[PDB]
Design an enzyme around this catalytic site. Structure first.
Site, PDB file in Angstrom:
ATOM      1  N   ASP A   1       0.816  -1.213   0.000  1.00 23.19           N
ATOM      2  CA  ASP A   1       0.000   0.000   0.000  1.00 23.19           C
ATOM      3  C   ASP A   1       0.851   1.265   0.000  1.00 23.19           C
ATOM      4  O   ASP A   1       0.329   2.364   0.200  1.00 23.19           O
ATOM      5  CB  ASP A   1      -0.889   0.048   1.243  1.00 23.19           C
ATOM      6  CG  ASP A   1      -1.829  -1.141   1.349  1.00 23.19           C
ATOM      7  OD1 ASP A   1      -2.076  -1.809   0.321  1.00 23.19           O
ATOM      8  OD2 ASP A   1      -2.331  -1.390   2.465  1.00 23.19           O
TER       9      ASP A   1
ATOM     10  N   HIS B 174      -5.402  -0.328  -5.563  1.00 22.30           N
ATOM     11  CA  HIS B 174      -4.030   0.002  -5.195  1.00 22.30           C
ATOM     12  C   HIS B 174      -3.452   1.070  -6.118  1.00 22.30           C
ATOM     13  O   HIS B 174      -4.140   1.576  -7.005  1.00 22.30           O
ATOM     14  CB  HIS B 174      -3.151  -1.250  -5.226  1.00 22.30           C
ATOM     15  CG  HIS B 174      -3.244  -2.084  -3.985  1.00 22.30           C
ATOM     16  ND1 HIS B 174      -4.331  -2.883  -3.705  1.00 22.30           N
ATOM     17  CD2 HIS B 174      -2.384  -2.241  -2.950  1.00 22.30           C
ATOM     18  CE1 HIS B 174      -4.137  -3.497  -2.552  1.00 22.30           C
ATOM     19  NE2 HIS B 174      -2.964  -3.125  -2.073  1.00 22.30           N
TER      20      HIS B 174
END
Ligand SMILES: [Fe+3]
Lengths: 421, 419
Positions: free
Chosen positions: B193, B219
């Site tokens: 992340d 993402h």
């Protein structure tokens, strides 16, 4: 217009695939005869473009279609796609460790019966989950478990049987079935190389509790990289799915606060082994040709075996397992020890002649360097397994090979064996 | 001509994308403000068609390009693509169990220090390899490990530290490194992340022995499903690769001249992707710098405007001496506000504003942790607070200032600040 731009892109693609995916005529000496390969065309490239245009990326439209059509082909209600044949095997065995299965959940220290003459990822899942592999010898020339040896490998810790239908040939499903039932053992059918094979008229992978298959380019159908896990049990299907999807909870413990997002509630120790719809589309196209491919493999197999009969004094030809109709993945041959040469000599001679060969995978898993410190048991001896490791190899009979391809191969065996004189 | 058909198809999809992938204008009450999402266009669809046309399917042309360009972006020599962020984490930890690392290899029973406030697959590989997870508390409002608590979790069985840069914000790398070096511990940076995040000016994922990243749609960049494992060590690269590729080599009692392609040096999986996935990611890489700046911008804008609710909620704070590439906007509802998190989340949902909780909240309380063997040093006070009072909202490139303005007005409305 959108629906218009698509149909017109399909055209330019259907015409590109005409030049690109057009098979070239066989040319002895220059053309190669690989041991396996993919056969794709316009449909494959067309659906993949469609999936690309969709812009969805994760599984969906095409993946739904695929799981459904494969389920209809295999004749099972539950099919889950995953990243590869190996991932399929990993998800199959791991799902059986689910505490939701209560007393028959696989636990560390329990045993799983299998064979040492196979592919590493057919057995790795067992070791990766803390279980113990128990090996018994295989048979020649079927290259599958000598089912009669299974019963003696069973013990108090025995918990399941995970074996693969090696090269598309089936293993004695009658004896395996009998043993599994008598001891209430789980049965996982690794059909990674046997899509389309049948035993006693019934499709392979529908006899055990869970079945797996691979879509790597070698195999009956491809997605580039991909595989599937299938079963007839709704309970197992929900378990498998959970392990594949981060281990998050589904179907329908811990001390999470009331109203905690279900999306973030995890009931299993999970991975993320999903694929894209681009991969699913390719496989969907491929599914249209499966019946065609299974038929051709059976044809090439017979043609090659009949023609290679002339070398029967130096090599043992493959034999389908009794009461089965295998969808051959390849053509397994065992060089006789009293022939006067080594497998290296034949393999190399064939290599120079453009004829591809492959050994029977791991040969003998227990002798593989990574098995150096692995905990396992072997019941009896792995005599045939070691013979396979030393004397066996296989060649191609996949849909991409024509009679001209095979005729060339047969003549090279004859030449190599001086039978042309 | 074939070269023509390609360029001709490229055009037909280039105009298909301009219509399909066209951002619609924000419309208060109708438009949704999701917590995360992807932003793809013409380039993405074009390369995926190219790859489809190639007919190669397995990794190749596009994957080589992707691993190369990403290695240049991160500043590392070795990047290996795999099926997901989770698979990357699995390969990172597993690779360190390789007997080739000798006395340095992770063995069953050894410990890996981490935090309970995170994503399950950051910790699962430790458990799946027979190791023991050792947890320490996290900090608020950075939502990353309270590094000062790490030293005390170190024992004689400790061998590594594997934690993620939660939501893009970085964890105290200065302290983690100090501890790692003092005890010769392996360090795995989970950057699933945090693609683009930096600490002390250096790109996240290049401080540890191995780094990982995810390409799932939610993402920074996507491939639909995909991830990558990266490192600066040639030795690890070879090990990672082997485990990813059936565990094949490149001992035992195999006969001489046994096919090397069928010689297996590790207990392996098959976690590879297709070139179709790689192409999409290659396109995406052409926008990473844009996406990282926009997320940083949206974050600042949202935090400044949301400052009007500081009496009821605790706003996020970047970790000292770092420049995080925010994945999301984490918020902790104060307990003395008179309402519960469920109330705010439901209000927001009704207003079309998406929310997510901080993943597992507290892994040790998750049902699958019921019989898992682990240790916790100290108390998971903040971790439990997160599980009960924290959640995050979007600030990804797909969100404009109008999207954010609407979100801010709803928070104010909720707390009666517009009165
Ligand atoms: Fe749900």
């Amino acid at each position: 217009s959108q629906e218009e731009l698509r149909q017109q892109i399909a055209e330019l693609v259907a015409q590109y695939a005409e030049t690109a995916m057009a098979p070239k005529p066989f040319e002895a000496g220059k053309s190669v005869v690989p041991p396996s390969g993919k056969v794709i065309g316009t449909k494959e490239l067309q659906l993949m473009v469609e999936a690309s245009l969709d812009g969805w990326l994760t599984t969906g439209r095409f993946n739904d279609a695929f799981e459904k059509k494969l389920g209809e082909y295999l004749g099972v209600p539950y099919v889950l796609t995953t990243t590869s044949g190996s991932s399929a095997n990993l998800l199959a065995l791991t799902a059986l460790t689910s505490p939701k299965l209560g007393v028959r959940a696989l636990k560390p220290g329990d045993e799983v019966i299998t064979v040492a003459a196979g592919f590493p990822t057919t057995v790795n899942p067992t070791i990766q989950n803390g279980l113990i592999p128990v090996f018994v010898d295989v048979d020649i020339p079927t290259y599958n478990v000598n089912a009669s040896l299974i019963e003696a490998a069973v013990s108090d810790k025995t918990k399941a049987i995970m074996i693969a239908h090696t090269l598309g040939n089936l293993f004695d499903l009658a004896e395996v079935r009998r043993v599994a039932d008598k001891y209430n053992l789980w049965l996982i059918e690794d059909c990674c190389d046997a899509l389309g094979s049948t035993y006693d008229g019934k499709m392979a992978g529908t006899f055990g509790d869970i079945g797996t298959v691979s879509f790597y380019p070698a195999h009956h159908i491809t997605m580039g990289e991909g595989g599937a896990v299938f079963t007839q049990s709704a309970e197992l299907k929900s378990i498998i799915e959970s392990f594949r999807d981060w281990g998050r909870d589904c179907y329908c413990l811990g001390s999470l606060p009331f109203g905690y997002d279900h999306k973030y509630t995890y009931s299993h120790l999970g991975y993320n082994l999903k694929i894209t719809d681009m991969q699913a589309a390719c496989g969907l196209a491929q599914l249209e040709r499966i019946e065609e491919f299974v038929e051709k493999r059976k044809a090439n197999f017979k043609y090659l075996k009949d023609a290679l009969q002339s070398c029967a004094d130096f090599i043992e030809l493959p034999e389908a397992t009794e009461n089965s109709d295998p969808s051959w993945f390849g053509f397994p041959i065992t060089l006789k020890e009293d022939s006067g040469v080594s497998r290296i000599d034949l393999v190399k001679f064939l290599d120079e002649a453009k004829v591809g060969t492959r050994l029977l995978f791991a040969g003998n898993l227990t002798r593989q360097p990574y098995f150096h410190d692995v905990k396992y048991r072997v019941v009896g001896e792995l005599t045939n397994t070691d013979r396979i490791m030393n004397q066996t190899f296989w060649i191609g009979i996949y849909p991409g090979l024509t009679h001209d391809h095979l005729d060339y191969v047969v003549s090279k065996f004859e030449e190599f064996f001086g039978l042309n004189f």
